[PDB]
Each structure stands twice: as C-alpha cells, then as structure tokens.
C-alpha cells in the first residue's frame, strides 16, 4: 500500500507493483 | 496508495505502479 | 492516490502510474 | 489524485500519469 | 485532480497527465 | 570533439559533455 | 571524438561523455 | 571514438563513456 | 571504438564503457 | 571494439565494457 524505497546508484529498475489484475512486463 | 520513494543518482527507472487492470511494459 | 516522491540527480525516469485500465510503455 | 513530487537535478523524466483509458509512451 | 509539484534544476520533463482517453508521447 | 546528435520527441536530456576537469551533475 | 546519436521518444538521458580526467554524476 | 546509437522509447540512460582516467557514477 | 547500439523500451541502463584507466559505478 | 547490441523490454543493465585497466562496479 505505502512502500518505502531508498536507492543509490540505481542502474536497473525497481518494480514494487501491487497487482490485483493481470499484466505483462 | 501513498508511496514514499527517495532516490539518488538514479540511472534506470523506478516503477511503483499499483495495478487493478491490465497493462504491458 | 497521493504519492510522495523525492529525487536527486535523476538520470532515468520515475513511473508512479496507478492504472485502472490498459496502457503500454 | 493529488500527487506531491519534489525533485532536484532532474535529468530524465517523472511520469505520474493516473490512467483510466489507454495510452502509449 | 489537484497535483502538487515542486522542482529545482529540472533539466528534463515532468509529466503528471491524468488520462481518461488515449494519447501518445 | 565534433558530436553529431539527432533527436525526436526528446523528453529528457542528452549529455555529450567531454570532460578534461571535474564537474558534478 | 565524433559521436553519432539518433533518438526518439527519449524520456531519460544519453551520456556520451569521453573522459580524460575525473568527474561525478 | 565515433559511437552510433539508435534508441526508441528510452526510459533509462545510455552510457557510452570511453574513459582514460577515473570517474564515478 | 565505434559501438552500434539499438534499443527499444529500455527501462534500465546500457553501459558500453571502453576503459583504459580506473573507474567505479 | 565495435559491439552490436539489440535489446527489447530491458529492465536491468547491459555491460559491454572492454577493459585494459582496473575498475569496480
């Protein structure tokens, strides 16, 4: 619901997707 | 719902997508 | 709903898209 | 609905798009 | 609906587009 | 030295900085 | 030396920095 | 030396840095 | 020397750094 | 020397670093 993310020198991706339906990446 | 994100030197992407339907990336 | 984002030296992208329908990136 | 964004030295893009329909990027 | 954005040294773009239809970027 | 850049629908930034000293972004 | 870059719908950043000294991002 | 880059829907960053000295990201 | 890169829907980073000295990421 | 990279839906990073010296990641 309420996500706490701290990053440093991020080269890739951060996925914090809370899903109730369908999806593709 | 209410997402707290702190970043530094972000080169990539941050995805915090809360999904109820469908989507593609 | 109400998203709190703090960034510094952002080179990429921050996606905080709350989705009820469909979309592509 | 009401999104609070604070940035500094933003080189890329910040997408806070709340979607009810379809779109492409 | 009512989006609160604060920025500093913005080099890129900030997209806070709330979408009900279709669009491209 | 002589940089050839072609762009279209640029939302972010393009950095082609050739550096001999120090700098921060 | 002479860099050929073609882009489309760029949301982030393109860094083509040729470095002989020191720098930070 | 002469780098040929073609991109589309770039959300992150492209680093083509040719380095002879030191640097940090 | 001359690097040919083609991308699509890049969310992270592409590092094509040819190094003769030292550096950190 | 001349590296040919084609990608699609890249979430992480691609490192094609040709090294003659020392470096850390």
Numbering used by the authors:
A (entry chain J), B (entry chain H), C (entry chain F), D (entry chain D), E (entry chain B), F (entry chain A), ...: 13 to 37
Tell me, in the authors' exact words, what the paper reports.
In this study, we outline critical insights from hundreds of grid optimization efforts to uniformly distribute helically twisted amyloid fibrils formed by the human islet amyloid polypeptide (hIAPP) at physiological pH. hIAPP is a hormone peptide associated with the β cell loss in type 2 diabetes. It exhibits diverse polymorphism and has been a particularly challenging study case for both solid-state NMR and cryo-EM. The human islet amyloid polypeptide (hIAPP) serves as a notable example, as the majority of reported structures have relied on the use of nonphysiological pH buffers, N-terminal tags, and seeding.
By applying the proposed strategies, we have resolved the structure of the dominant hIAPP polymorph, formed in vitro at pH 7.4, to a final resolution of 4 Å. The enhanced ice coverage and the abundance of monodisperse fibril filaments observed with HEPES buffer facilitated the determination of fibril structures formed at physiological pH. Notably, over 80% of the particles corresponded to the same polymorph, with only a minor fraction representing polymorphs with longer crossover distances. The resolution of the reconstructed 3D structure after Bayesian polishing was determined to be 4.01 Å based on the Fourier shell correlation at the 0.143 criterion. The final map presented clear density for the majority of the peptide, which enabled the construction of an accurate model. Cryo-EM results also undoubtedly show that the N-terminus of aggregated hIAPP is outside the amyloid core, and instead forms flanking regions that are exposed to potential interactions with monomeric rIAPP. The double S polymorph observed at pH 7.4 is consistent with previously reported structures from both ex vivo and in vitro studies conducted at pH 6 (38,66).
